[PDB]
Amino acid sequence: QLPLWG
Amino acid sequence: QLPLWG
Amino acid sequence: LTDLKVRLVRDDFADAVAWVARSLPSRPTVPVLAGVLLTGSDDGLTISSFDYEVSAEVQIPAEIAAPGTVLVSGRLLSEITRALPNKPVDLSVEGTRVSLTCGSARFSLPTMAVEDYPALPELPAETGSVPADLFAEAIGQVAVAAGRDDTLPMLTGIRVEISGDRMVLAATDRFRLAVRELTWTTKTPDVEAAVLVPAKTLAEAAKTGLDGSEVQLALGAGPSVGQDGLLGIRSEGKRSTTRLLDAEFPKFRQLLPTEHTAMATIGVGELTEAIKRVALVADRGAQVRMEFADDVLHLSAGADDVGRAEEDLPVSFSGEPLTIAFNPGYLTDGLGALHSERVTFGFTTPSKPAVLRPATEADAALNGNGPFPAAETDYVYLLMPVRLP
Amino acid sequence: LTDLKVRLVRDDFADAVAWVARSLPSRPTVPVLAGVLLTGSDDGLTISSFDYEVSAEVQIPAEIAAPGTVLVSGRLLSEITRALPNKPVDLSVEGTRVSLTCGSARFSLPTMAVEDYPALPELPAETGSVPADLFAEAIGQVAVAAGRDDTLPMLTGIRVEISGDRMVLAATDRFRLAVRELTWTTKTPDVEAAVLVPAKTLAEAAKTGLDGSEVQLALGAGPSVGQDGLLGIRSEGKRSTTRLLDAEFPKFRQLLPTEHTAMATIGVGELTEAIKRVALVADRGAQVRMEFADDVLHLSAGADDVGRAEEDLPVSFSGEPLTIAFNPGYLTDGLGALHSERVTFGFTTPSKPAVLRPATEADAALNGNGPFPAAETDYVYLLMPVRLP
């Protein structure tokens, strides 16, 4: 899972 | 509470 | 040389896997026990589960292209089948995997070590037959009184006594005793035996199993009745087995009174709702106080720190006035098991058990000072009271 | 000099206490906070609860024999009112206790320290009105994306942005962003403010409350809009307040794409069922694979230790072929929030967010290799993908 930001 | 036997 | 290849109807397969999957264990020490066993042969498919204690097995119609056996994840197969389109299900064992195809959905599950899967218990000889609905009901009416893990193993079972065409079920937790008598059709008259069945298991079989009008009980025949070590149940294409308990059930009959000093008849619904209302204010110290006098029942409960409630009901009371306290949940459990429009209480002393049984016309023709002989009833819920300050 | 004595209709009372009891805390450090405040005056009764964060207050008709205020146990009053018979409810404050009578049922509860009970917050100045149904819907469509208490405070809230007669609700958990725009009626001109409301509280107020046709939001007026520290919600005879979050919401707008390299339109229900079937074999419900090519969507998932599933669906696809993976739960959350019969996906890279929005006829008017301008919509569900091996 990738993050939208960070 | 009482028991039926014991 | 042979691998299972079968076409099935979705409803048949999903329902069968659903019933079988209920008897499955969760993360068992023996992994194969988490699997459902599928055995296809001739024109049928057998779906099985087993966990050393309980076994479930059902046979459904099947178009067999190639017979065989396979073990697949039980819960996973259950979820899949319950989520399949209403289309034919094609199951095909491909080496180490199991292809399941339904409409446009296609699954490929890994096979389990069927080599290491235990043999399912063979049911004992049929002992007799019981109507499904009546059997399930009786189990329900008695199970309410069975104990749990919090107590000794003997209290965790339902005693099943068979004497000819008449069987009685019994259960107790040291505070409430439930006894239900019902007639059945035995295959060997004068069969006289008693066994102890895990209450949880039997109740489950009552709610989910027992299809059709007739249910065959398999406990043995003649002298070996109950000597096999497990209870079998057969009805329609379904068949299940349950390991019996070796613990000795208490001699419950010598808790039942022979005469009552007081009798009280009242409507179940009315009494139950009043108990539920008044009990809201009884806390961890759950005591509903019942005061019988004339033809009035005065319910009360509570402590000043939480509150204090009370409510009066009309009651057909006969005998000496009485003030007796009970656990509200135990009381509502018995009332809920009576399955009668009207309940009759039999009292002796505020520190002695109370008989709860369905009301009968005879109870109406009952106006005296007492005592009152204990009537012959099919169901009795004997509840032990709470000491009064 | 005056003790509350009032007669009430059961339904009005039980419903009011039920709604107010939802905002009650469990085992609060301040005992009086567990109480419900009853204030009877003129021809009405007001029922209130508060926990330093959320306030609930509702007024109902009442026959006042004597006005007054009393604080009683909230959950206990809620249970009692649930269990009361459908008869008039007589409430009477007598000394240190509160008598509650309904038919034959009589309760006597102890009064709590109304002296130490905090004052309820006063709603800020009315800011605007919103259709009840639309407001609740928008909240539901955004709350799905809000983070849980485990994460940072900023993510545990729904941002409420107002700019004239247009308001925007936004929520994110760092993996999914939900934004809903809707029209409302501002009672102040050219207002431009943004606040952050606890997502749980707002979603709860939407599900249980928001009665009537219109809902009045109270954040202030003029320049003090949103600076009062709390959000007020008034609808019918109900009013509630919520303490706002001080944390600053992310600049969620710079996560949205301006153009898409690929577009895909499909039926919500169809895609949802297929996702729910295929996701049964994902190791932890962690990853479902979507392969778009021509006009076909090849869903897949699973491992060799659990199982492998796949399913093909017809899809209106335009642009460069794409293979991108998502979390099955997150995906179904978005699809469930669309509230449309047909969904449109906007894709760029398998490593960049995907846009989920309701479909439109304009979407069906695309037949180029792309790119495609990001259309304007009322609701958008931006979902971040899962890395592929």
TrEMBL record, chains C, D:
The keyword Ribosomal protein belongs to this UniProt entry's keyword annotation: no
Ranges where the DNA polymerase III beta sliding clamp N-terminal domain occurs: 5-121
Per UniProt, residues of the DNA polymerase III beta sliding clamp central domain are: 130-251
- The question of whether Transferase is a record keyword is answered with yes
Superkingdom per UniProt: Bacteria
Name one cellular component (GO) term: cytoplasm
User: What's the name of the protein?
Assistant: Beta sliding clamp
